[PDB]
């Protein structure tokens, strides 16, 4: 319905400008401070090292930036592997899920080329498995609810409301198992704050996958089973979450 | 069938182990290239500037890292959180692309981002479905003229349906995969392969962030910055439709 389509366009377009205003107002001040700190660091270095021109230091910094950007670590001079078998497994998963954290980048042209086909074939394959698991999990959940639903029907609360309350229990546990449980897990395991962990979980299950936070990626932890196993969580959550994302969609269409 | 999905799980897993082996074999031998480059930069600097100790340069590099980590950029209009870039960043969310080349630093930023997405993604999905339908219509409608030609040529109506799909995607591909990749090559001084990698990583909504095109506007070519936003919208729609139908073919199978 062309009218509706343009209305929707204007709407979203406003949802974005709205987002923009908020993130600017919330993040720009931190950013301008950092830009200031960098310049302070340069100026301090010049005053200490008269054998260095501002312009030369500038190049040093550009070169250092490029290397850190490529995943160099400031702390050391040079063991653990980003591409070790467990981590590579994990990396692939990030593709077919479309999450795409990207905390570790491909460097080889061959890597990029293979990645293209790996995804084109991998994502639809995964989508199908996901639909499958979504149906199967909902079924298991629905059968489970039925037994407690039987108790509500005896208590003479209407079949219409009993169904609604069950939803509340239904998601609340789902959320408990897939949102709340993991966030509590991650806080303790990754040294994140409550809020960081929830941020991570949600960024993950929406498949946004910023990559600022990645469970397991931490170099120090000797926890091999953990990170793929987390992927096991990711499978459940993503399915449970997909069920939800369509539904907030329905509510949105209704208004 | 539950048995069948369990079988499907194993298939995937093998698809993952298979992927793992390839990336490991392809990338492990370059894990440490960036360190090596950093060290080279240090050692070169020391040789040029005898008034600097390794340890002092070390701190410089830590302090620089902290600042870049906060969003600073090397100087020699760069604001990632000015209006235009924040708009773009919000887009990366509702699309679920999530490049992440710019991170949120504030806890408030993270908190707001959660709700922004929960409400934003479904809202965008709906607009996307809408645009997918409207665009598919324009496409299929155009193809209609060629379909008329095939029907005259007494090509079976069933194959005519197939050729139209091939066209349907092939024409999109030209406009949405091939055209942009050629565009970006020239604009971003990326290689042919880098550009395709980018395009596809983007339209699959994987959004690694190693390559990003539309974050800031380009003086001397104004149309660039929006055209990309427009492109992403259409491309995402064209890609979704492929997936739903290839998904569509897949689920019955």
């Amino acid at each position: 319905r062309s009218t509706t389509l343009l209305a929707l366009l204007a709407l979203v377009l406003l949802y974005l400008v709205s987002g923009a205003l908020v993130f600017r107002a919330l993040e720009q001040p931190h950013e301008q401070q950092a830009q200031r700190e960098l310049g302070e660091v340069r100026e301090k270095f010049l005053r200490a090292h008269p054998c260095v021109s501002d312009q030369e230091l500038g190049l040093l910094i550009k070169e250092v930036a490029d290397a850190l950007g490529g995943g160099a670590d400031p702390e050391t001079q040079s063991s653990h592997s980003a591409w070790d078998l467990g981590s590579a497994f994990f990396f692939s998963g990030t593709i077919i899920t479309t999450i795409g954290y990207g905390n570790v980048a491909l460097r080889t042209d061959a890597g990029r080329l293979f990645c293209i086909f790996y995804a084109l074939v991998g994502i639809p394959l995964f989508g199908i498995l996901l639909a499958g698991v979504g149906d199967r999990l909902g079924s298991s959940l629905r059968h489970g609810i039925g037994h407690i639903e039987a108790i509500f029907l005896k208590w003479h609360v209407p079949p219409e409301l009993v169904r609604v309350l069950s939803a509340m229990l239904f998601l609340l546990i789902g959320c408990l198992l897939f949102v709340l449980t993991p966030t509590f897990v991650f806080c303790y395991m990754e040294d994140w704050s409550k809020l960081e962990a929830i941020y991570f979980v949600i960024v993950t299950l929406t498949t946004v996958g910023f990559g600022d936070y990645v469970a397991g990626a931490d170099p120090r932890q000797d926890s091999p089973a953990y990170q793929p196993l987390v992927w096991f969580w990711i499978l459940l959550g993503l399915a449970y979450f997909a069920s939800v994302l369509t539904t907030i969609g329905n509510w949105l269409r209704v208004v | 069938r539950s048995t069948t999905l369990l079988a499907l799980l194993a298939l995937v897993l093998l698809y993952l182990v298979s992927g793992a082996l390839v990336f490991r074999a392809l990338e492990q031998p370059h894990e440490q290239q960036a360190q090596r480059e950093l060290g080279e930069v240090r050692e070169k600097f020391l040789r040029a500037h005898p008034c600097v100790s390794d340890q002092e340069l070390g701190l410089l590099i830590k302090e620089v890292a902290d600042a870049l980590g906060g969003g600073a950029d090397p100087e020699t209009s760069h604001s990632a959180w000015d209006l235009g870039s924040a708009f773009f960043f919000s887009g990366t969310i509702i699309t679920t692309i999530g490049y992440g080349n710019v991170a949120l630093r504030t806890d408030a930023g993270r908190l707001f981002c959660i709700f922004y997405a929960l409400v934003g993604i479904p809202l965008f999905g709906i607009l996307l479905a809408g645009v997918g339908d409207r665009l598919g219509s324009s496409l299929r409608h155009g193809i209609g003229h060629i379909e008329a030609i095939f029907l005259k040529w007494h090509v079976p109506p069933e194959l005519v349906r197939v050729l139209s799909a091939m066209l349907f995607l092939l024409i999109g591909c030209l406009l949405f995969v091939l055209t942009p990749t050629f565009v970006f090559c020239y604009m971003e001084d990326w290689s042919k392969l880098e550009a395709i990698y980018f395009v596809i990583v983007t339209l699959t909504t994987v959004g690694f962030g190693d390559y990003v095109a539309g974050a800031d506007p380009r003086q001397d070519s104004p149309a660039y910055q929006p055209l990309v936003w427009f492109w992403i919208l259409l491309g995402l729609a064209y890609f979704a439709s492929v997936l739903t139908t290839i998904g569509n073919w897949l689920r019955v199978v």
Epitope: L46, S53, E56 | -
Partner: antibody, heavy 116, light 107 residues
Framework: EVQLQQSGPELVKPGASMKTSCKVS????????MNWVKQRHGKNLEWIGL????????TYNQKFKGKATLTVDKSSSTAYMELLSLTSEDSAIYYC?????????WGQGTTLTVSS | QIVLTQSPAIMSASPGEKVTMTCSAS?????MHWYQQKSGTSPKRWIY???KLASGVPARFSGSGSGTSYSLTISSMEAEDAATYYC?????????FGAGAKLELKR
């Protein structure tokens, strides 16, 4: 007592080029950045560019990118500036001064006259 | 290409008077430096890093400021203070200069 001693006034024809020098004493030539500055009869000061005597590195004010070449002789701890295809607009006083953030020591200046 | 404005370009002071000359920057700057020039001779570093006094300089001189606004002050004018004063910046390359402020003796 740091000192930058510049060579004497120079007179050249329009179209010619010119080279002028600045010897340093009282400190280590290769330890500090050298700059040149133009002052056209008693008016604003204009930074021409710098050279790092130790590394050979140079950068120039965009205004002077084509016009001026900076070099150094490490052994005699002397800095040089060459100016090219001179016009009457180039007649001015030119200083060498030292520094990477403030210009802490200056030569006494040298006057360039461009004339027929 | 930060631009430094010194206004007014000319001023005069009787001996004993307090003198203040200012430098506004087109965009923020972390430190300002000042040079004294007497006609016939090269500029001398006078004040650097906003408020540090160079070796020779008498204490009647001071400097202050921040961000985009900086100033040089003489608590009590003297005769040998007649000169041109220039501000300069190097928080961004290329370094740049104000166009000078000429300070003559009143009489």
């Amino acid at each position: 007592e740091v000192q930058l001693q510049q060579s004497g006034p120079e007179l050249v024809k329009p179209g010619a080029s010119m080279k002028t020098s600045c010897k340093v004493s009282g400190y280590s030539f290769t330890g500090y950045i050298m700059n040149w500055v133009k002052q056209r009869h008693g008016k604003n000061l204009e930074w021409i560019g710098l050279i790092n005597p130790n590394t050979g590195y140079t950068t120039y004010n965009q205004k002077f990118k084509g016009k001026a070449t900076l070099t150094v002789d490490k052994s005699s701890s002397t800095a040089y500036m060459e100016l090219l295809s001179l016009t009457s607009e180039d007649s001015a006083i030119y200083y060498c001064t030292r520094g990477n953030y403030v210009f802490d020591y200056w030569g006494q200046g040298t006057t360039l006259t461009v004339s027929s | 290409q930060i631009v430094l404005t010194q206004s007014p370009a000319i001023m005069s002071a009787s001996p004993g008077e307090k003198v203040t000359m200012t430098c506004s920057a087109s965009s923020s700057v972390s430190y300002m430096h000042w040079y004294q020039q007497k006609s016939g001779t090269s500029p001398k570093r006078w004040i650097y890093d906003t408020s540090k006094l160079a070796s020779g300089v008498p204490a009647r001189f001071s400097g202050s400021g921040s961000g985009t606004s900086y100033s040089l002050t003489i608590s009590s004018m003297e005769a040998e203070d007649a000169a041109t004063y220039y501000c300069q910046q190097w928080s961004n390359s290329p370094p740049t200069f104000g166009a000078g402020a000429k300070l003559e003796l009143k009489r």
